[PDB]
Design a protein around this ligand. Structure first.
Ligand SMILES: *[C@@H]1O[C@H](CO)[C@@H](O)[C@H](O)[C@H]1NC(C)=O
Lengths: 125, 201, 108
């Protein structure tokens, strides 16, 4: 059935780069408004960014505290959603989830309600 | 109302690739001047239908938000996109509420979508267990299960893929042609008015 | 920025009311997610007043101006979890999230 799988992450010195991959199956990837979200251990969920769909213009946004230093990308041929992290800080030790905004929802608005989530990966800086 | 702050509602009516009916697109309009006179006076719009607001007095009442919904369907079920009827697309792809307000627009794409090789990227749904509530997408592509038997994701017999492809070619006639459809809906009485047309004298 | 209380103490079999405070909740209606201990967050309530299929008919949503709230009718022992409300800001169209809240079981 429909599945999101997260890969990547580990221990790395600050200031480096690291690429996190999300692989999706069971639904049409080209028309999905995927997102990345983070959570520190013991704290609440914190948004990372959006990637949106090419049918409607690529409008990949970013969160305010992590604006610019993170790179987000989509590839529909290999069914991959990529997050590239560079110029890391000491506060980036967190779990990371790739989350599909829309699978079975009613919108009335921009198409984002975060229906299905992922198993999520460690990252320690 | 100057007019300089025109929201980009031209490309929602004229773009490169329209979304398919099962994965239709939505666009949100805020802080704009709503001049529909450039579109009403334009020639090749074949269908202009709405129920709640007047077809020509649409510049004299002022709204707060505008949602532009875009997709492409076969030419017959442009009859079926109105609220109330059922069948394919109305129940399995896109449903409008009974108290819907806003105007639906339909036009032909004879020389913009038909390819001699044959285009199959425009999909539609034929098999759904439940019924679609109004204004709801469905992107999941898990195979249908028919009552019993172990095809619950094995993808064999007695179990059918839900997303099928259209038949889109110069040899086709009226009724199988691709019609682009855009629905302008709106909501009221929860916010200060932002989007509506200019002032004349 | 949303606002939530840290924890609510409600005995078993009693209606639980969960609040969420925000300035921009008149539009951009909040959505409520539930996080189990050591599990990925799951959807509970979104949209105007409805919920995804498979969720039991115990969680309902309500909104009034700058207030959002979730209602639990007849809670069981498996609802000890964290709850998060989500809204959008007007300018940047971000999902902002909130502080979350905790709900525990007060039986024997
Ligand atoms: C789409 O076609 C209409 C037809 O008049 C035209 O006015 C409009 O400028 C076109 N869109 C673009 C982006 O050129």
């Amino acid at each position: 059935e429909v599945q999101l799988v997260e890969s990547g992450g580990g221990l790395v010195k600050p200031g480096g780069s690291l690429r996190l991959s999300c692989a999706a199956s069971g639904f049409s990837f080209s028309d999905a408004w995927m997102s990345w979200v983070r959570q520190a251990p013991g704290k609440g969920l914190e948004w990372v960014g959006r990637v949106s769909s090419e049918i409607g213009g690529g409008t990949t946004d970013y969160a305010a505290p992590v604006k610019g230093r993170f790179t987000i990308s989509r590839d529909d041929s290999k069914n991959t959603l990529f997050l590239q992290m560079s110029s890391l800080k000491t506060e980036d030790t967190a779990v990371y989830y790739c989350t599909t905004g829309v699978d079975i929802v009613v919108m009335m608005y921009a198409d984002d309600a975060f229906d299905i989530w992922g198993q999520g990966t460690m990252v320690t800086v | 109302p100057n007019i300089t702050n025109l929201c980009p509602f031209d490309e929602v009516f004229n773009a490169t690739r329209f979304a398919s009916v099962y994965a239709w697109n939505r666009k949100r309009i805020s802080n704009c001047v709503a001049d529909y006179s450039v579109l009403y006076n334009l020639a090749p719009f074949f269908t202009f239908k709405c129920y709640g607001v007047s077809p020509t007095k649409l510049n004299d009442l002022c709204f707060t938000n505008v949602y532009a919904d875009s997709f492409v369907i076969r030419g017959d079920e442009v009859r079926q996109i109105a609220p109330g009827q059922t069948g394919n697309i109305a129940d399995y792809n896109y449903k409008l509420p009974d108290d819907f307000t806003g105007c639906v627009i339909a036009w032909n794409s004879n020389k913009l979508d038909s390819k001699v090789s044959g285009n199959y990227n425009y999909l539609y749904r034929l098999f759904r267990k439940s019924n679609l509530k109004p204004f709801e997408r469905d992107i999941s592509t898990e195979i249908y299960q028919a009552g019993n038997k172990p095809c619950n994701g094995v993808a064999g017999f007695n179990c059918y893929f839900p997303l099928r492809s259209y038949s889109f070619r110069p040899t086709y006639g009226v009724g199988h042609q691709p019609y682009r459809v855009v629905v302008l809906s709106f909501e009221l009485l929860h916010a200060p008015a932002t989007v509506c047309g200019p002032k004349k004298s | 920025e949303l606002t939530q209380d840290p924890a609510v103490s409600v005995a078993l079999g009693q209606t639980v009311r969960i609040t969420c405070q925000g300035d921009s909740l008149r539009s951009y209606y909040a959505s409520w997610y539930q996080q189990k201990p050591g599990q990925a967050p799951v959807l509970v309530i979104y949209g105007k007043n409805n919920r995804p299929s498979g969720i039991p008919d115990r969680f309902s949503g309500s909104s009034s101006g700058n207030t959002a709230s979730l209602t639990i009718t007849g809670p069981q022992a498996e609802d000890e979890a964290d709850y998060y409300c989500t809204s959008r800001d007007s300018s940047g169209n971000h999902v902002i999230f909130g502080g979350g809240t905790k709900l525990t079981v007060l039986g024997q």
